[PDB]
């Protein structure tokens, strides 16, 4: 059994030839193991997602997506804070990272946010983020 660090580094390795579902799923499994796991997972995801290396970021978005699909209040709540949402907003915003982020990564972020507004309506700050992105013209 490895740290969240080691697991995320496997699951998002630029050298991976395809999605590493063993390491992705094991990351989701492990983040709930102790009390502070989920906030750590979200810290680690946010950094990976801001990678200038597209495949590193795309894999990390797939991790995010996968863990969000499964039951877990603490992780749902961490992702549903601006402390994490803001890291996503920076990737799609031209005033932060948006100008040198591929449209693939940016569109994926927008697609996921929408999906959470529908699938997790209790995380109201995700909807607030998404409505801001519409008002500012990022969506679309």
């Amino acid at each position: 059994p490895e740290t969240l660090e080691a697991r995320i580094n496997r699951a998002t390795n630029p050298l991976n030839k395809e999605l590493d579902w063993a390491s992705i799923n094991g990351f989701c499994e492990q983040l709930n193991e102790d009390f502070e796991g989920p906030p750590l997972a979200t810290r680690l995801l946010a950094h990976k997602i801001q990678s200038p290396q597209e495949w590193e970021a795309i894999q990390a978005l797939t991790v995010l997506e996968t863990c969000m699909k499964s039951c877990g209040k603490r992780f749902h709540d961490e992702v549903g804070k601006f402390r994490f949402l803001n890291e996503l907003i920076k990737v799609v915003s031209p005033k932060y990272l948006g100008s040198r982020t591929s449209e693939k990564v940016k569109n994926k972020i927008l697609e996921l946010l929408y999906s959470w507004t529908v699938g997790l309506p209790e995380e109201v700050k995700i909807a607030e983020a998404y409505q801001m992105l519409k008002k500012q013209g990022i969506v679309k």
């Binding site: 804070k81 402390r83 803001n86 915003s93 005033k95 700050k125």
Partner: peptide
């Protein structure tokens, strides 16, 4: 939350 303010894109 204790959360931070939303950044505007």
């Amino acid at each position: 939350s204790d959360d931070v303010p939303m950044v505007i894109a």
